[PDB]
Amino acid sequence: TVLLEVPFSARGDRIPDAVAELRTREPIRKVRTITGAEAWLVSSYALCTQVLEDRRFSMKETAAAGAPRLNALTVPPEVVNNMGNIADAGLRKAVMKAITPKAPGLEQFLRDTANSLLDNLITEGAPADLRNDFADPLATALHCKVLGIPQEDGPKLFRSLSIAFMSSADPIPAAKINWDRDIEYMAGILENPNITTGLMGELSRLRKDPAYSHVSDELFATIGVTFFGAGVISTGSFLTTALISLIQRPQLRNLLHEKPELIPAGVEELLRINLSFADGLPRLATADIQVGDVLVRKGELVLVLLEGANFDPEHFPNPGSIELDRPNPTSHLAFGRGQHFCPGSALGRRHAQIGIEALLKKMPGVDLAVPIDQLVWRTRFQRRIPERLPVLW
Ligand code: HEM
Ligand SMILES: O=C1N[C@@H](Cc2ccc(O)c(F)c2)C(=O)N[C@H]1Cc1ccc(O)cc1
Numbered sequence: 001t002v003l004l005e006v007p008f009s010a011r012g013d014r015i016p017d018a019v020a021e022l023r024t025r026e027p028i029r030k031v032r033t034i035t036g037a038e039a040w041l042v043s044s045y046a047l048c049t050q051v052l053e054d055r056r057f058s059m060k061e062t063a064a065a066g067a068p069r070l071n072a073l074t075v076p077p078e079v080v081n082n083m084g085n086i087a088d089a090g091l092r093k094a095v096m097k098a099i100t101p102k103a104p105g106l107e108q109f110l111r112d113t114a115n116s117l118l119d120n121l122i123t124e125g126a127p128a129d130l131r132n133d134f135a136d137p138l139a140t141a142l143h144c145k146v147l148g149i150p151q152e153d154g155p156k157l158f159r160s161l162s163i164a165f166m167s168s169a170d171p172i173p174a175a176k177i178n179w180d181r182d183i184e185y186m187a188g189i190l191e192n193p194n195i196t197t198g199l200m201g202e203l204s205r206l207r208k209d210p211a212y213s214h215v216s217d218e219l220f221a222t223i224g225v226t227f228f229g230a231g232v233i234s235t236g237s238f239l240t241t242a243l244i245s246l247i248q249r250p251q252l253r254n255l256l257h258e259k260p261e262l263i264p265a266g267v268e269e270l271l272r273i274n275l276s277f278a279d280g281l282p283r284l285a286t287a288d289i290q291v292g293d294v295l296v297r298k299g300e301l302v303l304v305l306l307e308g309a310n311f312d313p314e315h316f317p318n319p320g321s322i323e324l325d326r327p328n329p330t331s332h333l334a335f336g337r338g339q340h341f342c343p344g345s346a347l348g349r350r351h352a353q354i355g356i357e358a359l360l361k362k363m364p365g366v367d368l369a370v371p372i373d374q375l376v377w378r379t380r381f382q383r384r385i386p387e388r389l390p391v392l393w
């Protein structure tokens with residue numbers, strides 16, 4: 001027998017029975033990654049929270065040369081410390097303020113965009129592909145608006161993502177080509193006088209403010225590339241798999257259609273049960289640290305399995321069921337926890353809430369147009385997503 005390999009399954013419509021067996025028997029245990037490295041896979045709520053809240057389990061140290069790797073880097077090593085670099089530049093407050101869903105008109109733009117996408121699918125007739133022709137275009141349009149960049153530039157930036165978020169054993173030549181091109185695009189945006197709104201408009205102003213005169217042009221461009229990429233891949237993939245979970249639950253679909261004020265609670269449960277992250281969150285130990293029955297040694301890789309935490313019955317009883325009245329509804333780990341908690345969490349919630357509200361109003365009869373087993377799940381990728389999501393209504 002060989003050492004247990006991760007990831008277990010690229011299917012995003014169901015959790016393997018294996019996760020519950022593992023959490024019960026060995027909530028921290030040694031696995032092999034796709035690179036051949038060994039790692040500790042953590043799968044209980046208690047131990048996942050412990051790792052994420054202890055900064056001695058470091059995300060920037062995962063990029064060190066010679067470290068055991070979950071996958072190959074698709075960005076320059078310094079970008080693994082992206083939020084640390086942003087904070088060190090004095091930019092964290094401005095960046096986080098620009099990516100909230102609170103800017104005037106933003107939520108209306110989201111609703112208008114969702115409704116337009118859905119009207120076009122209704123005109124064309126069933127079947128419709130809710131990933132490529134709804135959820136991903138909605139994420140792309142949102143992030144162009146949030147960044148302040150032209151909508152027509154969205155698709156080209158989007159098409160970098162099927163490579164940029166690969167989970168590969170080896171470096172990916174195309175990832176560098178696309179990264180360098182996207183950095184050049186964002187550098188041009190910062191020099192473009194017509195870009196005055198959104199995140200890039202704000203960074204463009206701060207770039208010429210004496211208080212930021214020593215912040216590198218490379219960092220400013222990197223913020224644009226990285227926030228577009230992480231935001232689009234994360235919101236598009238989450239919404240897509242949330243739609244499957246909703247379609248699989250006609251009673252829930254009808255409840256949210258009938259009572260749209262329950263959509264936020266519904267989205268929070270869809271977040272909790274979401275399988276969009278294809279790999280555990282990686283951290284490198286910077287000291288010898290006890291985690292359950294294992295003494296993790298300095299220099300070892302730890303993988304925090306989000307669905308391990310989020311389906312843990314000790315924290316979320318009847319964990320496979322969507323229940324809108326849980327006492328601890330936001331205590332899931334869908335956005336991470338601790339130092340690296342997702343800075344786009346509010347925007348991600350709103351993207352999904354508006355998308356779902358619009359879908360349920362326009363397509364109350366939405367159902368899969370193919371048997372669920374026919375969905376094609378993307379492999380060796382940092383998200384779990386079906387290549388196409390064919391629906392009828
Ligand atoms: C539903 C949508 C989203 C989900 C499920 C999600 C999930 C996550 C998770 C789990 C992390 C933690 C990674 C780790 O600790 O290793 C994270 C970090 C991050 N997310 Fe999100 N995210 C979403 C939306 C967004 C959006 C909209 C943006 C930007 C617009 C964004 C940008 C980031 C960035 C930059 C980080 C790194 C933060 C750091 O290292 O401190 N995400 N996200
Ligand atoms: O390595 C990082 N890189 C970017 C994210 C990123 C990755 C690849 C890209 O091509 C891109 F545009 C953006 C970031 O901000 N933080 C760290 C840690 C990290 C990784 C994955 C992740 O999903 C979220 C965070």
